[PDB]
Design a protein around this ligand. Sequence first.
Ligand code: TBJ
Lengths: 237, 300
Amino acid sequence: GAMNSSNYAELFNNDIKLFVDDTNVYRVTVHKTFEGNVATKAINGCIFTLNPKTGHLFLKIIHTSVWAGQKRLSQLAKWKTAEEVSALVRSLPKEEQPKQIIVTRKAMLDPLEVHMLDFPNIAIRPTELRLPFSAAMSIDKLSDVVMKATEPQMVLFNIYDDWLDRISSYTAFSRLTLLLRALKTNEESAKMILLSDPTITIKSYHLWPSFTDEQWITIESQMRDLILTEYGRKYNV
Amino acid sequence: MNTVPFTSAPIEVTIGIDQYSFNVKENQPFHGIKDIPIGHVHVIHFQHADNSSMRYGYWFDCRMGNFYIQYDPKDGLYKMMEERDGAKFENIVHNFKERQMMVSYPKIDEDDTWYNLTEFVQMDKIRKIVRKDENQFSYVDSSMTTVQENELSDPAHSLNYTVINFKSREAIRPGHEMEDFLDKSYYLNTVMLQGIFKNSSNYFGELQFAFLNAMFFGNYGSSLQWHAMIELICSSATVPKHMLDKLDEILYYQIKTLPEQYSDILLNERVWNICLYSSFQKNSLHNTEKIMENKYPELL
Ligand SMILES: O=C(NC[C@@H]1CCCO1)NC1CCCC1
């Protein structure tokens, strides 16, 4: 069944599961042609496949060449996503394969279902949550690897850095979704908060800065304030 | 012209014969149905006046034997039986006709409705969907489930329709996931037509038989089967031209004959809107589209 606020802690039990977000797979800039018509130009994209318990992120980079000479690209993007997720599952040892894949957009259900027919015991689930995984390209080292890629490439990251040494998965996922929600709602301000202080650095082997526990509390409060303000503006409340 | 005599009519019942129906009162001197056109299958069906649930009935073909109906007070229903003594049967039928105790199959000469609804339906195929090999006729009722329904519980009493499942290995070639799911032509033409049904006539016969079971008995699984077989054709980009033309005629008469009051439960909105307006074959079912629009514009 669908994943929602009510069964939220299922994400952090010991059944292997993956979120799959396809929102950055097919990315375009829109521009005018010499004749004054509109055209798109694709840029590199990515599938965001995330184990919310461990933080492991399988970032499959989608090179613009995959679209060459293809029609109905937004529909193709969903099947390409499902093809690559299915290939990822096949590549994993049996004991690492997920028991559930949760797609962030319901239009991925049928493509993934069809690509996963060989895994009848892997449940493909939609979600009612409005997760901010589109903002993954606001994380500088993920954006940098996607844009620099010259060919299809699968790269492994831990999106929680070392946080799990000190906090639980539930708390780690809440921090991640807060940071991403903030980056989605007002990227410039969120990034200002994260990097204002030059003395706090990002480890060469990490995605986020090396905050102490106390600094994280301050950071998290600043992201909350950001998100609430932006909202009052959105709705004039 | 053939006859299905009735031993008696002990309980009040509405009797249908093909698309016709008559009311018979408790212990009314009714003794059967004559002038049944040879050359087609037929269905004789029943709904008791006391129990408007479980419509039931029998598919038969008078070229395959002499059949009659007899009420069974233990099992509480009108049962079809075969009379193997041909002299004894002719004698009974001649006496009942002489005494004019039989209704006449009420075919108008101009009317091809029943032919058009049963064009591809064969008794030999019905008896493979309804397995009861000791009888030459086949019982169907409102409640019988299909094999596909069972997979998702008595096998002897199931409808063994061909299983169609758009998200199945059978339907989807490895490496053609997107192609085969969006264009079902290879599942239609190779898997189903060439492989399982062998020809389009057998496919159309099962489709027509499923529709008739849905209409006459309100058999829900039959209704599912009918719509699935429609959707498989409409969702294929490559369909022989003769099949599309014939499908348009098949569906036209099915929609024409459907009771107006039953369109809500017997017609699936999604399948019809997709077949007539979104699918590859949206422009290939002109007669069917025209009667649907003029008779059920609400559904669409
Ligand atoms: O490669 C690791 N991290 C993944 C990328 C590198 C930049 C950040 O994300 N870490 C390994 C090196 C030492 C520990 C394991």
